[PDB]
């Protein structure tokens, strides 16, 4: 087969999609009796977002299979823009219910973006770039969180609120996407298979790849077509009834669930707590959170290039294993830190290790992997399932973890460690290496595993 290359059209399409959708997502997540009322209220509001992501994940297949991947990204853009306009109206008139609805729409945007962007870039790019540009959206998510907290702090230093600059900052990616992206090729796979347009898909592939002759890739796509013709519509339920997609389904579910059950958010808002354990100043903890963001982003770029070179499997293994060791060593660390002052430092280092590990294997990979594993017609439903598992896991952890932490203290991380080890074992005995392989080949591997 002829190796594809990165063109200006593909790099700009990737950039627009990832920037608008996934960077507004990454930036957004940072933005996302009376005592008892406060805990239930606060809990409800923070619960509206992952429930929103759940709903958005459910409506992925509809939008994708009608409007296309790009069209889905544009609806993701109206679901993104509407809360901002509701914020302008909030400037005019504001209620707590509008806050709830805003976090709901923002949630929907989050889910739809997180699912569709790797799908779009996955069907757009050639297999190698499918892996790299598959990682890219999470890179923009890390960027976004980074710039979010950095610019938030810089704002606070500059002024209480940055309203015109912030509104402009949220407007720019959506504006650039809405303006430029519609003029960029749709998924050639969507065009040739679902929309049944040979010419449009041909020209799309021409502009994307940079060469005139797309024939081999198109006939490959039609190989996928005739592979999915036996399957049919493949509703989520039918997906659950299919043995051919079964281990693939279990793979997606275990991957997403494990990812969110790895205790990421615990690390997220208890980071400052361990920094307090170290004795680090609030400005200095702000600095080391900035540093963790930098680590995440940098190691996410490294995660792009290494995802392409080493493969997805080995990186999943590395990430989950490093996070497992991070967890266990963390528990022993927290036990030892109350006894000895040398340890908590170690705990800091180990936390950094965790951030790295999860930045490599667990976070970026599973979505692109959902794209890689399944075929054209079964991909969006699989994204509904995997996305649902993702946001529901984030919800479950979200509400349940406070009680577990308050009750069991440091031991809570041991459960996450068990999850990490089980997951790692699963990846060892299940997950194939999808690097450089066409969807058909990976489907043949998985089909072989399912049949036997």
């Amino acid at each position, epitope marked *: 087969e002829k190796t594809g290359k990165l063109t200006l059209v593909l790099a700009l399409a990737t950039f627009l999609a990832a920037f608008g959708s996934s960077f507004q997502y990454g930036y957004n997540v940072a933005a996302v009796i009376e005592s008892f009322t406060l805990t239930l209220l606060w809990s409800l509001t923070v619960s509206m977002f992952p429930f929103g992501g759940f709903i958005g994940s459910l409506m992925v297949g509809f939008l994708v299979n009608n409007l296309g991947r790009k069209g889905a990204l544009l609806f993701n853009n109206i679901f993104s823009i509407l809360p901002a306009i509701l914020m302008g109206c909030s400037k005019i008139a504001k209620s707590f219910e509008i806050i709830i609805a805003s976090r709901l729409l923002v949630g929907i945007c989050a889910g739809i973006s997180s699912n569709v962007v790797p799908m779009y870039l996955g069907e757009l790019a050639p297999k190698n770039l499918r892996g790299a540009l598959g990682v890219v959206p999470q890179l923009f998510i890390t960027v976004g969180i980074l710039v979010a907290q950095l610019f938030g702090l810089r704002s606070v230093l500059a002024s209480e609120e940055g309203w015109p600059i912030l509104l402009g900052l949220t407007g720019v990616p959506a504006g650039l996407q809405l303006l430029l992206l519609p003029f960029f090729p749709e998924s050639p796979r969507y065009l040739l298979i679902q929309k049944k347009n040979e010419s449009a898909a041909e020209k799309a592939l021409q502009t994307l790849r940079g060469w005139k002759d797309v024939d*081999m890739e*198109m006939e490959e796509i039609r190989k996928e077509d005739e592979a999915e013709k036996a399957a049919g519509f493949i509703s989520v339920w039918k997906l659950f009834r299919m043995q051919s997609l079964r281990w693939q389904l279990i793979s997606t579910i275990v991957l997403m669930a494990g990812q969110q059950l790895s205790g990421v958010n615990a690390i997220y808002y208890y980071a400052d707590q361990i920094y307090l354990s170290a004795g680090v100043k609030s400005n200095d903890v702000q600095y080391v959170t900035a540093g963790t963001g930098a680590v995440n982003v940098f190691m996410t770029m490294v995660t792009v290039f290494v995802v392409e070179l080493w493969g997805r499997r080995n990186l999943l293994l590395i990430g989950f294993s490093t996070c497992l060791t991070a967890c266990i060593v963390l528990t022993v660390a927290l036990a030892l830190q109350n006894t000895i002052s040398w340890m908590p430092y170690v705990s800091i280092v180990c936390v950094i290790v965790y951030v790295i590990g999860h930045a490599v294997g667990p976070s970026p990979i599973p979505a692109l992997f959902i794209t890689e594993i399944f075929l054209q017609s079964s991909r969006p439903s699989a994204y509904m399932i995997g996305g649902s598992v993702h946001w529901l896991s984030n919800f479950i952890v979200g509400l349940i973890f406070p009680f577990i932490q308050v009750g069991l203290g440091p031991y809570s991380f041991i459960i996450f460690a068990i999850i990490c080890l089980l997951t790692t074992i699963y990846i060892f005995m299940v997950v194939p290496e999808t690097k450089g392989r066409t969807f058909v080949e990976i489907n043949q591997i998985f089909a072989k595993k399912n049949k036997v």
Partner: antibody
Amino acid sequence: EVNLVESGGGLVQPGGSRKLSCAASGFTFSSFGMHWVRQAPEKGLEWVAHISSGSRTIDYADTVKGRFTISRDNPKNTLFLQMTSLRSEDTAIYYCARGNGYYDALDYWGQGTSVTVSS
Amino acid sequence: ELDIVLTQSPLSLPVSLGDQASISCRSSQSIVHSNGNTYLEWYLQKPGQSPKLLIYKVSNRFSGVPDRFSGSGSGTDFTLKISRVEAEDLGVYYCFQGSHVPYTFGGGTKLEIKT
């Protein structure tokens, strides 16, 4: 090394017919588009026809539309040009050329086969 | 009918070895392809030999083409430059566009040694 060797040429009367072939080796033939290019005696090069790797794309020079048919057989690693209703205008050396898809350009040429149309 | 025409100039270029030499190719309409690429190519043919690719995508040297060859141009105007003509460079140069069907060669430019 990469080789392209054309055959099937020779002397033919006006109104007559002739089928040219081009045998390819040293590369994966089915991954590359292919062209026919001609050159009349004491004349410049004249592009004749193109066929994509999978035969989905086929194009002809204006001077041959309706008269020439280009085809290819990828498993047999062979390019063909079936010519009919030949005229004096058509007397020329016929080159088959490789379409290199990273560049889209004719990077390899055969030695050519000579076709002569006359009494 | 849609005819993309390629014009080379001059038709004949007498040179001494070591000379700089430039060859022009003009298209009757823009030859930018729908793929965003511009497929203007230069080929060299020596007597009794088959043509060989020198330049592709306006300014890129093909594998094996010495750096004394350089291609340039924009839109409708294109140039092939030879910084120092060597004996092995003598022959007929053709420009070619592969952007718009039917594809077309220029009429050729003969690069020849002075006598």
